[PDB]
Amino acid sequence: AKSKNHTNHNQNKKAHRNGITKPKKHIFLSMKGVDAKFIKNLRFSRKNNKRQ
Amino acid sequence: VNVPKARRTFCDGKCRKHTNHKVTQYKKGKESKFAQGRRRYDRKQSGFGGQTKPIFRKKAKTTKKIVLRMECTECKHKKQLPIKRCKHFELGGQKKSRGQVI
Amino acid sequence: GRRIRIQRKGAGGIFKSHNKHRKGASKLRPLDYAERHGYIKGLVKDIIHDP
Amino acid sequence: HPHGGGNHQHIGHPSTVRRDASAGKKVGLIAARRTGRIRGGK
RNA sequence: GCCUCGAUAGCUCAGUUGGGAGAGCGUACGACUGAAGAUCGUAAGGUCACCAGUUCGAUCCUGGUUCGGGGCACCA
RNA sequence: ACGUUUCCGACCCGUCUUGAAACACGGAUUGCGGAGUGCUUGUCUACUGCGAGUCAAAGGGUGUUAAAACCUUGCGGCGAA
RNA sequence: ACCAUCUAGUAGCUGGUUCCUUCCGAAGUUUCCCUCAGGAUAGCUGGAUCUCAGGCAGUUAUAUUCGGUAAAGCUAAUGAUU
RNA sequence: ACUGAUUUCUGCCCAGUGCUCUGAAUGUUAAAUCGUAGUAAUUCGAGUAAGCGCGGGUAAACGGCGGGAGUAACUAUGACUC
RNA sequence: GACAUUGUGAAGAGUCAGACUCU
RNA sequence: CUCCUCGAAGACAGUGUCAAGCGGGGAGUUUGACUGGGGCGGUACAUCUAUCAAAUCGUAACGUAGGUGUCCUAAGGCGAGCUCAGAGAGGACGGAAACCUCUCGUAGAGCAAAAGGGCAAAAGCUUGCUUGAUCUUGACUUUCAGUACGAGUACAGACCGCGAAAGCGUGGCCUAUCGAUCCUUUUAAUCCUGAUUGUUUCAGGUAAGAGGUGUCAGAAAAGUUACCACAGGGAUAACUGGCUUGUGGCAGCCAAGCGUCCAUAGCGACGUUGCUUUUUGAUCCUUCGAUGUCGGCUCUUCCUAUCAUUGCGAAGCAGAAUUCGCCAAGCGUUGGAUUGUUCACCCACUAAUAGGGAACGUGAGCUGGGUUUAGACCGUCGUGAGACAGGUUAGUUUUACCCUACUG
RNA sequence: UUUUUUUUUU
Ligand SMILES: C[C@@H]1C[C@@H]([C@H](O)CC2CC(=O)NC(=O)C2)C(=O)[C@@H](C)C1
């Protein structure tokens, strides 16, 4: 009663059933994982710029 | 594996700098009979019912992770550093030579 | 398992002695003054077979 | 019986059992100091 | 077929981490004996089964090949 | 139209199964009975009332178409850190 | 042994699971589990809808890139080989 | 408990496992007890029985009871030898 | 094996300072 | 006269409680998984390399060839200098091989280990100094559910090492070398709590390590059942049937040779092409709410790859005889000893003693000798229960009156 | 203490 039976038969069809979802367009706006020193300097710069 | 008996390394205590440390091997302390776990285990064992907790019987490890206990010579602050597994371990053994006959 | 014959012998059921026709227990006379300070004469009236 | 069973009629274990064995196990030569035919006086 | 074990003088068996190849019998020489045998004093002796690798160096450690030997080979 | 006769089509249902008409299992026939429920606790959803509040418990007062309905909470639950 | 009760004992297993129309409509695949007749997990599916009114596409074009299979080569390295 | 009339016999092995007998045996041993430290919980140490471990016996107790070479005036075999 | 049931006398040894411990 | 009824033992025994030893006599429970059925074997269970893999990545089998549970105070870090394997040519003892010298030398060496990548003023060799193999939090990659562990990447803060400096350094040139909860234990704060107030012990907490689960996301675990049971399974074996035909059987093509000479009368090696399912295998499609599982007896029919007979052709055919071949299954293909036997072997006759199918034809046709329950014996194996396609003995063979077929 | 053998006829 062998029961390993791996396959990839219908998986592409299942994936395309609902369409392949491309990544959003705001992912490039976040500064997550950016250099800590650069982020610190950016925070200081943003804190001080005079609005008018 | 040979490890020197003295090592200059960062001191996490008051010094907050690199200082000399005497290196020894950490040995597990004797189990106290008034620890909460031992008290609970003894109370559970006492009575009728036989063994109440599993007994491990399938040892597979042939080694242990040696812990070097290093005590700073300036404030006696103590660090513990595990090293990789090794069959043989010695502290301050004879350093290896080069270009010598056997 | 079940009890062995040796274990079963102790309950004294079918393993009791068969003593319907026994003629009595073999015993000397109880110790008393005659036997302690002299002798007493008895007559052997019978010799019989005890099952 | 402790001796019962087997594809051959054999005891399988020593017939000499200790004095303090349990009621259902004390079968055979109980607390035997020796075994076999007696050669000499005894 | 599967799982193990061994292979070393002419024969039977040890041997070391890996740095010696040994023990007995056998063979050769001399001695004692009228002569042989026992006995005494000497000598020489192995395919470290074959191959490849590992390290300074392997009979040995590792892998493969040849021969021999042992155990299992059950249901129905 | 469950009558007859013609032409075409027409394998026995339920079930497990990759695959059943199966030489796979259940089923001779009919009537009646026959199987996702109750409750506690969560969560989401829909609707209703009020809304930083809301619901009020046990209880008390009343009620004789009196186990109902109606009135009643320094305090309690949830919410407000 | 038998009788009653615990007891409607538990079952990852076998069997059954009762009205009609309309619309949508799969999976036998991933990971973990004393796991392999089973579960949880993601995937596939239905429903409720809500926010809006051009940025997407199992398709092409342009531009730029990745690969070492077919073919080719050993009169080029390695390994065979007349 | 084993064997199983009569007749004739019942060989070797106490290494293993059992059973059993001695104990001087500080080898190992629980509770209790005693001593040390501490203000106390408590810590450390000493004794510490039987058993086990050491020694002996026992197989009509459970049971067990080998390999490789050479060798005889035809060959074969192997009394004999290693 | 210890404690209790468990009482009354002797001798020896050892601890102490009349007691305890043992046999 | 004596308030010991007469003796024995006697503060021991016995009794009560606790402690230790023995304790399958008895109780409860367990006795992994994968697997071309299970068992045995193996580990393909955690895991790395090359290939499979069909040019992104990904991709399976008990696929192929191998590796891992270690090793290293240096074999980590860094600075400097140097160049390796090997070849050629020279030099007392020196030889094929010791050391010295000069040329050439794209890496053909070495880098702890398996394989594959990478590396030449280095990542290799020599050497100096060192401990970045340290402390701290986040982000990310790999597996992936985009969980965890493990491993790794690029930064940020501290303190350091080497260097003149730029720089490099969080272990090993890269790809494997490893571990949850609970519990114990250690280190850390001049920390928190013990709730009648405080002090000190003790205990418990917050943070980081270690002690281990290799069935490696991590139960504490020995057998037997032929006295056996239950829920299921044709997801899964033993008998038939189905596919395949390695093996079994049968038939062809070229001719090197045999055949006194002569390859083909009759054979035919080395090669090679087919056929068949009366062998045994492979598979696991049907059947486990059952298709009665060997052989023999009995009785039909069918096929031939023709033993005999009919009609013929060819011979290494002068004839009893014998061989090959063609048309040919119309008709025959026996009696027995041994064995349960199918097979096998022998005795005898015979025209001949041909081979096979029909659910390995035929058990509501028989029989039951074998196999194949429960009783029992021996050998080997096992401590034991018990096991053994090892031997032996004894062991219940049920139902047609229905439909069809067939006979009347 | 140990101390085994001597081919056939003459
Ligand atoms: C660290 C490792 C494990 C640990 C212990 O046994 C593990 C626990 C785990 C659990 O959840 N329950 C248990 O009863 C056992 C132990 O004493 C040693 C084997 C060492």
Separation of alpha carbons A6 and B86, rounded Å: 40
Nearest one of B70, B57, B59 to B25, comparing CA atoms: B70
Cβ contact B22:B73 at 8 Å: yes
Min distance C14 CA to chain D CA atoms (Å): 19
Atom index in ligand 1 nearest the CA of residue B56 equals 19
* Tokens encoding C11: 């309950």
Pairing between strand B6-10 and B18-25?
antiparallel
Cα–Cα distances in angstroms (integers) from residue C25 to residues A1, B33, C12, C29, C50, in the given order: 80, 67, 20, 12, 10
Q: What element of type H or E holds A11? A: helix A11-17
Q: Can you give the distance from the CA of residue B26 to the C1' of nucleotide H37 in angstroms? A: 28
* Tokens encoding B36: 């909460």
Q: Kindly list the strands in the beta sheet with B18-25, ordered across the sheet, starting from the edge strand earlier in the chain.
A: B6-10, B18-25, B65-72, B78-85
Q: Is B28 in the pocket of ligand 1 (CB under 6 A)?
A: no
- Phi, then psi, of B68 in degrees rounded to 5: -90, 115
Amino acid identity, position B47: G
Helix, strand, or coil (residue C7): helix
Cβ contact B100:B11 at 8 Å: no
- DSSP code at position C4: P
Helix, strand, or coil (residue B91): strand
Judging contacts by C-beta atoms under 8 Å, the chain C residues touching residue D27 are 4, 6
Subunits with 3+ Cβ pairs within 8 Å of B are: none
Separation of alpha carbons C20 and C51, rounded Å: 9
Residues 15-34 of chain A with CB under 7 A from strand G are: 15-20, 22, 25
Give yes or no for C6 touching D (CB within 8 A).
yes
Nearest one of B65, B66, B74, B67 to B8, comparing CA atoms: B74
Q: Please, what is the Cα angle at C48 between C46 and C51, to 5 degrees?
A: 155
Cβ contact D1:D10 at 8 Å: no
Burial class (CB in 10 A: 0-12, 13-18, 19+), B67: middle
* The residue to which tokens 């398992």 are assigned: C1
Cα–Cα distances in angstroms (integers) from residue D30 to residues A30, C38, D19, in the given order: 91, 47, 6
The resolution in Å comes to: 2.6
Q: Is C7–D24 a contact, with Cβ atoms under 8 angstroms apart? A: yes
Separation of alpha carbons A38 and A23, rounded Å: 26
Amino acid identity, position B8: R
Residue D16 Rama label (left phi>0; alpha psi -120 to 50; beta)? beta
* Tokens encoding B56: 């491990």
Nearest one of D14, D32, D17, D26 to C9, comparing CA atoms: D26
Task: Identify how the structure was determined.
Answer: cryo-EM
Cβ contact B81:B68 at 8 Å: yes
For chain D, the residues whose C-beta falls within 8 A of a C-beta of chain C are 1, 23-24, 26-27
- DSSP code at position D15: S
Ligand 1 center–CA B28 separation, angstroms: 16
DSSP B37-81: HHHHHHHHHSSSS---S-----------EEEEEEEETTT--EEEE
DSSP D19-36: TT--TTT--SEET-S--S
Ligand 1 center–CA C22 separation, angstroms: 73
Separation of alpha carbons A40 and A28, rounded Å: 19
Cβ contact C23:C48 at 8 Å: yes
Burial class (CB in 10 A: 0-12, 13-18, 19+), B72: buried
Separation of alpha carbons D35 and D28, rounded Å: 11
